[PDB]
Every structure is written in structure tokens, then in C-alpha cells.
From a paper:
and the human pentameric Ragulator complex. RagB, promoting their GTP binding in exchange of GDP. the Rag GTPases, thus mTORC1 can be activated by the lysosome-located small GTPase Rheb.
α3-helix feature which are present in Lamtor2 and Lamtor3. between their α2-helices as well as β3 and β4 strands. β3, β4 and β5 strands of Lamtor5. -F63, -V69, -L76, -T78, -V79, -F85, -V87. semi-independent subcomplex, and so are Lamtor4 and Lamtor5. stabilized by Lamtor1, and by their assembly into the Ragulator complex.
Numbering used by the authors:
A (entry chain A): 9 to 92
B (entry chain B): 2 to 90
């Protein structure tokens, strides 16, 4: 079975605050604020259908890790994942 | 950064790429094709800028990807030029 890369931290936001966090993301107010802003913009973004958030996942890919962000609907779920 | 019209055209040649757009830190629509146009340029510029705040770069400039069932929009800054590409799956 396929090898899934390690998680490096989680963050759950429930506007505006940190509801839960662990690992690299634990009590990191700056990251939580910056994610919250990115997510609000991404959520407000429309391609060609007003009644459609044009993503099911937002991923921010860095050299060694990626932040995987899902929204529903006033909460934000973040996993920091090692790259494959 | 130098000319960029040629790159927009070559990129669109890919049969899954349905849109491309370049902006800067200001949100200037520096050229777009296909599915991405003026009303998208601003939000695209803001996203890249907001995503950059998620690191104090090890020279680690992120790619922002908005993933949908049908395709993806991939956004990266390089350099002072922000390039968004709309791909079908």
C-alpha cells in the first residue's frame, strides 16, 4: 500500500481563533492569521459561476512541505504535510 | 520581466491549459488568455502575496493551487511577475 507522507502539524480555525493546533502550527498566531486571510480571499474568488466556490482544496506547496487547506463553512482545516 | 506575450501563447498550446494570466505585486493585468481575465487578475495577485507571508523564505516561494473536480488553478510568483495557469484535469 502507498506511503503517505508525514504530517508536520494541524490547525483548525473557527473564525477568527485557533480552535486546535499541533506540531509546527501549534500556537503560531502569525500562521493562523496569514492562513485565515488567504482562505477568505480564496473563498471569495469566483471563476465563471457565482454560486460555486472554485475549489474543494487549497494547497500551498513549498520546497519541502505543503499546506493542505479545506473549508467548511466557517471553519478552516489545515494539515502541514511533508512533500511526496 | 522582459517580454511575456510569447510565453502566454506557448503555454496555451497545451491542450489542458485553458487559461493563463500574468500580474505583478500591483495587480496589473500584464496579459491573459482564455479562462482568466481582468476580474481575476486582482484576486490572483492578492493570493500569491498572501501565500508568500506563510514563510520567511529559505528562498522558498510557494505555489498556490486551487483544486477543483475538473481542474486546477496554479499560481506562482517569479519574479515580480505572478503567473496563474488554469488547467483541466
Amino acid at each position: 500500500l502507498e506511503r503517505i507522507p508525514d504530517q508536520l502539524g494541524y490547525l483548525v480555525l473557527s473564525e477568527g481563533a485557533v480552535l486546535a493546533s499541533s506540531g509546527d502550527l501549534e500556537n503560531d498566531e502569525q500562521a493562523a492569521s496569514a492562513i485565515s486571510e488567504l482562505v477568505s480571499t480564496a473563498c471569495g474568488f469566483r471563476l465563471h459561476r457565482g454560486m460555486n466556490v472554485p475549489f474543494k482544496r487549497l494547497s500551498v506547496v513549498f520546497g519541502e512541505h505543503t499546506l493542505l487547506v479545506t473549508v467548511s463553512g466557517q471553519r478552516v482545516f489545515v494539515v502541514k504535510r511533508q512533500n511526496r | 520581466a522582459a517580454t511575456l506575450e510569447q510565453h502566454l501563447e506557448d503555454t496555451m498550446k497545451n491542450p489542458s491549459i485553458v487559461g493563463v494570466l500574468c500580474t505583478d505585486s500591483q495587480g496589473l493585468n500584464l496579459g491573459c488568455r482564455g479562462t482568466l481575465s481582468d476580474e481575476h487578475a486582482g484576486v490572483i495577485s492578492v493570493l500569491a502575496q498572501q501565500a508568500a507571508k506563510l514563510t520567511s523564505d529559505p528562498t522558498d516561494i510557494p505555489v498556490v493551487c486551487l483544486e477543483s473536480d475538473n481542474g486546477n488553478i496554479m499560481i506562482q510568483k517569479h519574479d515580480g511577475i505572478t503567473v496563474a495557469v488554469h488547467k483541466m484535469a
